Design an enzyme around this catalytic site. Sequence first.
Site, short mmCIF file in Angstrom:
data_model
loop_
_atom_site.label_atom_id
_atom_site.label_comp_id
_atom_site.label_asym_id
_atom_site.label_seq_id
_atom_site.Cartn_x
_atom_site.Cartn_y
_atom_site.Cartn_z
N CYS A 138 -27.00 -2.01 3.07
CA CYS A 138 -28.42 -2.03 3.46
C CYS A 138 -28.94 -3.48 3.48
O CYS A 138 -28.13 -4.39 3.35
CB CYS A 138 -29.26 -1.06 2.61
SG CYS A 138 -29.40 -1.57 0.88
N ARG B 77 -30.63 1.19 -1.43
CA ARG B 77 -29.98 2.27 -0.69
C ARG B 77 -28.47 2.27 -0.92
O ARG B 77 -27.92 3.34 -1.17
CB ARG B 77 -30.35 2.24 0.80
CG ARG B 77 -31.85 2.53 1.03
CD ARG B 77 -32.23 2.58 2.52
NE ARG B 77 -32.21 1.26 3.16
CZ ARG B 77 -32.29 1.03 4.49
NH1 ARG B 77 -32.53 2.01 5.34
NH2 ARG B 77 -32.16 -0.20 4.96
N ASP C 28 -36.27 1.66 4.77
CA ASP C 28 -35.84 0.89 3.61
C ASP C 28 -37.01 0.85 2.62
O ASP C 28 -38.12 0.52 3.04
CB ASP C 28 -35.43 -0.53 4.03
CG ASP C 28 -34.74 -1.28 2.87
OD1 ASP C 28 -35.41 -1.57 1.86
OD2 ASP C 28 -33.52 -1.55 3.00
#
Length: 147
Positions: A9, A15, A115
Amino acid sequence: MFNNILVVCVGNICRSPTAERLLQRYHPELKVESAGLGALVGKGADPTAISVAAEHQLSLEGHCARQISRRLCRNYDLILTMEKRHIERLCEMAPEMRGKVMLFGHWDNECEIPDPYRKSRETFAAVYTLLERSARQWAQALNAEQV
């Protein structure tokens, strides 16, 4: 069996370790690890990512952020991420892996995921819920497609 996976990520701390541990929860024998495209190399898992993981009794413990590099891309046999923009960067970094970068939401009409960076815990929990189903679908494919 693509036993060796690297999840990726932007900032790494959120993540990637969430996905790593979710994949391990469903396949303890999987070699899965976590990196980032603009990683915060040396930092641990994010406190908010840890919080939502602990609310589902998963432990992001001992994660360390790592700038993904062409050598890291060669080190694993499947590169995994959450967004098609990240697939594009990873294919540019390692053309030799362009056929092996895919996203978590591939099994969900190739839907990509936000995100959480510094947003509220509700955002971390929403992406966690997305990641949890995506990790089950990746684990289902990993369990299947034996040859």
